[PDB]
Design a protein around this ligand. Structure first.
Ligand code: LMT
Ligand code: LMT
Ligand code: LMT
Ligand code: LMT
Ligand code: LMT
Ligand code: LMT
Ligand code: LMT
Ligand code: LMT
Ligand code: K
Ligand code: K
Ligand code: K
Ligand code: K
Ligand code: K
Lengths: 359, 66, 359, 359, 359, 66, 66, 66
């Protein structure tokens, strides 16, 4: 069968999804290093600002080679899946425009074409490196086991899940909420703080670097907004709006996660229901005794004909029988819920019993 | 309130026969409830002891209490 | 039948709901153009400030003609529906007051009756143009298919839905959350920013136009509130309170949308339940082997009479059987939920089987 | 029967709950009038500041008479309910301390014992009038029909609802969310703004009256916090913290209300399910035709032996059969949910059918 | 049996969990007293700053004795539970590293080794006392009855609850929300305010003590952020970020608590369903009468041949029959839900009836 | 609308026989509804009183009303 | 893909007999789908018209198309 | 812990007969678990090989292990 070859191509796509992510991250890191070296170093280090700037070009040429090699594996996977024999049939028209839109976005490095400011030109090309962050959901989806098993693709084709990026989002968020939601916001704070420090530099008095924006970004993200530092430039305000929008969205995500993580499941409901069952019977006995004591002591102080020291015990008798009726009617509706939990499966078994009992 | 008194006795009716032992009838007020006096419990046994056979049919005892 | 005529009137109402919305939007746009032209142009452009001001009057006369023509179609629809023959019966008394309240609100333009400030009079009439935004839910409701089908009105009359504006709100919000909730807040930011720029102009030093209020409105909406710019006038503070109230309401809407979009449906629950089922059996076998290895190696180092190098394997044996009991009791309650999902329909089929089995 | 008398006492308690609320509100209003008259009027109006100050004493003596008359109706209701004949038995010990704690709190007016500041003494007694706002949940509970019907008290004693103030809270919040949640926050803004204006007066430059605190309170309530005005005194900061806490609680209430008001009920689910059912069959036919056209046109351009103009139609054939399988598998799981909705009651009727069929 | 000894060890662990918490809290209190005494007292009180500093050392030596005595009870409990006879088998390897990590963290007091500032050294050791707050979840878990009953450990081993700290979190939060969530935030405000006052002291002008930070911490916690006081030091900003993160988490917790506390249970749903059932029948009769009056009066004014005074009653007749159909279709779907509530248990009883009816 | 008129009568058909008493037919308009005129109610009794036996079969009354 | 072609024909099999009329077979491509050419539809009728009786058994037509 | 040992063997009892093959008994420790030594596995076969017929009844093997 060809199902051994189809699975074989999905380890050649997993590696080409991982190593492309490595060669994109090592371009972003060298971009950050160049942008900070040109600020802290000036025009004296004009050799290293050529060396790193061409190392970025070598890395992005290797990245542009590790995407054509990926889409070739996808078109071979398409030919293997639907049973074709010519690649010219297997390629689409909109897909071949996605190839060009992917190669252009993965090729916007600041090249070595030619005091510490980047300039109006290359500061946008340097921040266009961050648009490589679409390579991470592809790699996460391929490293997960849902796409990488035809036994999983069978149940997916029975369900029309169709290998969404949103299903693994729901998966990793229902399985590991706190690791994902803790790493994501710290990554957003560091990335957005650095981009804001690029947008606001202020060589006079050093009033725009990470010592200010690492304080301005979480205060915007959590929607505190003291206002001791505010963004000054038109490009800083766009970044400080896109930080607040993500802060509202992450708070709205955290509310739903914490709302799911408070309810009981089946098994914790059972032990809660047992801890209450051993506890209401104690008060069912205690308040019964509290009825029965005053029930005799009021008749005793009545037969002793002391009408002043009997009204107090009649008052406590009324309070005790009120408390006893409260705890009894509270006790029976718990056991009603105990009977309510085992309704469906017991009827499903009793139906199979009474079916065989008819013969 | 006599129905509430009988239903309070019916908690300690582990036999379902309408009779309760004097051991349990002393232990209910003695070990639980609000409090317990020894002379009041012995006087309660002296008052309920029209029979004194170690078991009390509480249905007549409710009527004697009310 | 008259059900061909009843459906025929609901395309004459859809067009009169759309073209009234077009002639209201083209009045609002010319109002904005006049308010900005009188600010950036002054008293020198007194010809164009008469031309646009009377173009608004022509447009709002066409709007006052496209509402009487709508309510005539509604009263003909009422006569066709309930089987009447005189329009004087078909018209209500409260409806004929709604006609007047609709024609007054749609007629508050700044007319050409008669340095860049509007004045105390016409600045309120210019902002009363925005009260035409009740024409959009009517047009949205008529363009939707729920009112425009008597086969839908039959199921609505079986359900008493009664053609609410709130049902299409729930509909468009359950179908397209992000498009609606993304377009709505941007529309609110632009509209409210312009209204605040009208309320705060400050001809000296230009400290009130859109370069300030386009920053002040989202910072209020997201409840950040830096405070570098604050509203200065009594009319600016009402607008900045009504922005914060809508910001709290849209955050409360976003929380519910994101809370619905995280749970699994039936089909994603099945593939999650299968991905866990192929994964717990691997550990059910692995931990079993981890029991069985130490189970022999402890007896080996016991029979070899080396009591120092046997206690470590006894420790690992206890840890391994603890892990094995954990993974086995974790494995069986998953398959309990697998049996729990197919309870109701299988009993509904087994009931129909055992009904025929009784004969 | 005495159930005609028991219901008769619960209109004498409804009136004594309403008129006590009127005579508490007319004390709070005269307190506000006195506090503002002593500020805007000074020492010249020493006659009216005696007249209003003793009118408050007359009103609070009438209030202290309309509470003893209420608790007498409650103790007569207790004697009628549990069948007593002496009031000395019917009164409790903790209840008679609640009487004293109620009469002290309802008696803290600024009396006429003896420049525009109130002084350290009577400014706390004037704000202790607001502690009369426990008279409103009692009046709301008695005006509601749940306590005022023994036919409702029967089902309440079957359920142990026990006439909670929280049940009518859930009731009025599930029935009328927006009226309650709109009136409540405006009442909180006006009341808290006035209390903050009392706490911060600043006779020099008039920097503490309602023109500042009516802006400071909603900005704190919505958690914006510009910071152009901040509270200056130690008593202003307690009020501005208790405003922010209520703002967080009302936002947390609004989130739950808006989360309930978005889901469908049964009947809107049915018409949504029908609007989708008439809509997926249109695409089930459309995409079938889109398969069938290309299915013949590819064979036509194959038999015509034009292999260049046939691969495009083979590509569209693959896309069309992919879309057709998507819309068919999307179409069948809708009708699975249509079959899923009518499961339980149809089985409950089929069980009663097959029970009689056994004879 | 040994189940009497196993329960006996769990009161020797409850006491050693409580008294260790007391001797940790009395170390934290003396640390706070020393830090404030060295600030308000200076170098003149060099005797008491030696006396309290060595009292802390005596207290933390008693704490380091009350943890070894706890883990000895845990290893004796392990030997009693799994049936061992040598402690060298019962101790683990990772557990014996947890012992060292626990004894180091519980031993970081400022010792008496050797103007009002603490210094760079001992200010971190003094704040490392707060890391003793892991002793409180252990004590809370042992004082709760879920671990302290082998009859509870049986149902826990049937459910694999495994004595989590998170189950008692869900337990105390579902039982007592407001007490826990009210005490926790006040404890966080006082603790975090004091730590921020340590981080920001400013001996000149006294601008960092609790009169500033007790205002700065709740304003950060509720995410207001006026900005009149901001943190000034690098260590103050970490504390003001960790306050805002906890504020977002507690708001996200409060939203879920208030969302659970608004829905009806079974018994409140029944009395709501009865209050509506006695109320819709009143309008079912009232609107029927409103139909029947106009139904005769229109025929009367028609037979009287006054066609002008008959059209008004025909209009009201149409409005009244519209209202009657609305209230009837509203009335029947309530009683449909009344029939919907008693579906499952009645079928479970009717199945047991029809099973015996087959014989 | 005759079906709606008959269904409105069927609310007060507590007998299920197709006839309603003149007491209830006076009390429905008299005690409830929008309003009640005494002369109009007596004229309604005079108009419906082709029988006048204290009970009215409303099925013919609907046809006489329409 | 022949199973998908047959399942696409089975949408318009409102008779359940394996045959479809030439009226519906012209109306499916004519009124719906991507587009319709008159000469291509007439040539489709000329190609499928090995019978020409107003009804086509599509099961052999699938094999002739593939 | 002998019940836990038997339940761990019962995972690899795909026959339900109380016997497991020496191939699977070598493959369970060899391919999975913590680790595998070749000489220890061969000595395990030498120790369990009181029969040596390619199949081991593990019920006596549990008793020999404990
Ligand atoms: C989702 C949307 C996100 C939007 C992200 C866009 C981020 C854009 C970052 C701002 C980039 C340009 O930002 C700008 O950088 C230039 C250099 O490039 C710097 O500008 C500075 O250096 C230039 C050198 O040419 C001088 O001419 C100029 O006078 C001086 O201000 C500023 O620091 C900043 O004004
Ligand atoms: C929709 C949201 C769009 C938000 C855009 C923010 C507009 C900010 C205007 O940006 C403003 O630029 C001018 C000219 O530099 C200056 O004023 C300030 O530096 C900056 O506040
Ligand atoms: C949901 C509620 C929403 C509330 C919306 C109401 C918005 C109202 C916008 C403010 C309108 C009037 O706002 C006001 O405009 C006038 C001109 O009209 C301007 O006022 C300015 O021009 C006028 C011309 O007459 C001068 O006399 C005046 O001295 C000067 O301040 C100001 O800019 C603003 O104070
Ligand atoms: C309820 C909510 C009502 C909010 C109303 C806000 C009141 C604001 C008072 O408005 C104030 O007007 C005076 C006189 O112009 C000035 O003071 C300021 O300009 C403005 O802050
Ligand atoms: C849930 C908790 C709510 C807490 C609510 C408590 C509200 C308390 C309001 C503050 C009341 C006292 O507030 C205080 O009032 C006094 C007069 O009384 C005023 O004080 C002013 O007048 C007094 C007159 O005696 C002068 O002596 C003083 O120098 C001057 O400041 C101030 O305006 C304010 O400091
Ligand atoms: C727990 C929450 C407690 C909040 C209490 C807020 C403390 C505020 C201290 O109050 C402060 O008082 C002093 C002396 O007047 C001044 O400093 C300021 O006026 C005020 O900010
Ligand atoms: C979850 C993470 C929580 C992070 C918690 C960490 C809290 C740390 C608190 C800050 C501790 C040190 O904070 C620092 O204290 C020192 C003394 O120690 C003080 O510093 C002051 O006294 C020192 C004495 O040595 C002088 O030398 C110095 O010039 C002066 O600023 C300051 O007040 C503060 O800068
Ligand atoms: C990730 C989040 C990390 C947040 C860290 C905040 C960085 C704050 C920088 O801290 C800054 O220190 C320098 C030197 O003291 C000064 O600038 C200020 O005092 C302070 O604002
Ligand atoms: K906020
Ligand atoms: K601020
Ligand atoms: K804020
Ligand atoms: K703020
Ligand atoms: K500020």
């Amino acid at each position: 069968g060809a199902l051994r070859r189809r699975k074989r191509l999905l380890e050649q796509e997993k590696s080409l999804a991982g190593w492309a992510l490595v060669l994109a991250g090592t371009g972003i890191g060298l971009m950050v290093l160049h942008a900070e070296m040109l600020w802290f170093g000036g025009c004296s280090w004009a050799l290293y600002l050529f060396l790193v700037k061409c190392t970025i070009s070598i890395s992005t040429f290797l990245l542009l080679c590790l995407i054509v090699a990926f889409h070739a594996k996808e078109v071979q996977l398409f030919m293997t899946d639907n049973g074709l024999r010519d690649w010219r049939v297997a390629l689409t028209g909109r897909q071949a425009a996605q190839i060009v839109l992917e190669l252009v976005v993965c090729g916007l490095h600041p090249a070595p074409v030619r005091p510490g400011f980047l300039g109006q030109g290359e500061a946008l090309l340097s921040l266009a490196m961050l648009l490589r962050l679409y390579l991470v959901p592809r790699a996460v989806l391929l490293r997960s086991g849902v796409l990488l098993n035809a036994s999983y693709r069978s149940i997916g084709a029975l369900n029309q899940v169709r290998f969404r990026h949103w299903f693994v989002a729901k998966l990793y968020m229902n399985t590991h909420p706190g690791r994902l939601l803790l790493g994501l916001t710290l990554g957003l704070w560091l990335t957005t703080a650095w981009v804001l420090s690029v947008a606001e530099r202020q060589a006079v008095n050093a009033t725009g670097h990470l010592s200010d924006t690492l304080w301005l970004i979480p205060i915007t993200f959590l929607t505190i907004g003291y206002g001791d530092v505010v963004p000054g430039t038109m490009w800083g305000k766009i970044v400080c709006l896109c930080t607040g929008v993500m802060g509202v969205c992450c708070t709205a995500l955290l509310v739903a996660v914490v709302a799911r993580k408070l309810e009981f499941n089946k098994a914790e409901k059972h032990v809660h229901n047992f801890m209450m069952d051993i506890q209401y019977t104690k008060e069912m006995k205690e308040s019964a005794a509290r009825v029965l004591q005053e029930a005799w002591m009021f008749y005793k102080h009545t037969r002793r004909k002391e009408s002043h020291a009997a009204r107090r015990h009649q008052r406590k008798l009324l309070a005790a029988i009120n408390a006893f009726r409260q705890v009894r009617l509270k006790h029976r509706k718990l056991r009603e819920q105990v009977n309510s939990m085992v309704d469906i499966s017991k009827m499903h078994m009793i139906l199979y019993d009474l079916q065989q009992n008819l013969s | 309130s006599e129905e509430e008194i009988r239903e309070a006795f019916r908690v300690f009716d582990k036999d379902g026969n309408g009779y309760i032992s004097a051991a349990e009838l002393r232990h209910v007020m003695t070990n639980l409830g609000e409090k317990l006096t020894d002379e009041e419990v012995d006087e309660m046994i002296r008052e309920a002891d029209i029979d004194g056979d170690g078991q009390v049919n509480y249905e007549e005892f409710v009527q004697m209490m009310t």
